[PDB]
Amino acid sequence: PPVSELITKAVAASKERSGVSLAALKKALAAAGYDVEKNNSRIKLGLKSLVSKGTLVQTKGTGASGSFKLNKK
DNA sequence: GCGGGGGACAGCGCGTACGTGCGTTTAAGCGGTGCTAGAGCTGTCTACGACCAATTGAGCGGCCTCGGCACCGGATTCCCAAACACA
């Protein structure tokens, strides 16, 4: 399954008012059996694609270093 | 021993400052010349310090006193850490 679903599912499972950090996303995908080490660069890209698709709102920071929430709009 | 909160450490981004490279300029390095100030050595003779015996008073041990400082309690003050006021 593509990493955009795994990320969206992790952000939905940890839904809050702040927003899953990249470190929490790493932890959730690793707990989901996804190798976050080798494919970290893929994650940053896929995450960026999800922000560029507007599917994730950046709530703090800039780019992948930030916190993110599912764009309910 | 325990609760917790701040700091250490991890991850990311970015932007500019440092490394690499190239061409030009500059002055370091080398050699060579010349000059003279001063370092190094020597002889003299003289004032200056070591040595010694005698004198003595300055300093050291021993005693004694009191005041400066330590201590205690009581009152004063000074940050602090919430804490709510209020925009």
Swiss-Prot record:
The modification Citrulline is found at residue 17. The modification N6-(2-hydroxyisobutyryl)lysine is found at residues 9, 15, 26-27, 38, 44, 48, 53, 60, 73. It comes from the Eukaryota. The modification N6-succinyllysine is found at residue 60. Signal peptide: none annotated. Residues 1-72 form the H15 domain. The modification N6-(beta-hydroxybutyryl)lysine is found at residues 15, 27, 48, 53, 69. It is found in: Nucleus; Chromosome. The modification Phosphoserine is found at residue 67. Disulfide bonds: none annotated. The modification N6-crotonyllysine is found at residues 27, 48, 53, 60. H1 histones are progressively phosphorylated during the cell cycle, becoming maximally phosphorylated during late G2 phase and M phase, and being dephosphorylated sharply thereafter. Histone H1 protein binds to linker DNA between nucleosomes forming the macromolecular structure known as the chromatin fiber. Histones H1 are necessary for the condensation of nucleosome chains into higher-order structured fibers. Also acts as a regulator of individual gene transcription through chromatin remodeling, nucleosome spacing and DNA methylation. Interacts with TSC22D1 isoforms 2 and 5. Belongs to the histone H1/H5 family. The C-terminal domain is required for high-affinity binding to chromatin. This is Histone H1.2. It comes from Homo sapiens (Human). The chain holds residues 38 to 110 of 213 of the full protein.
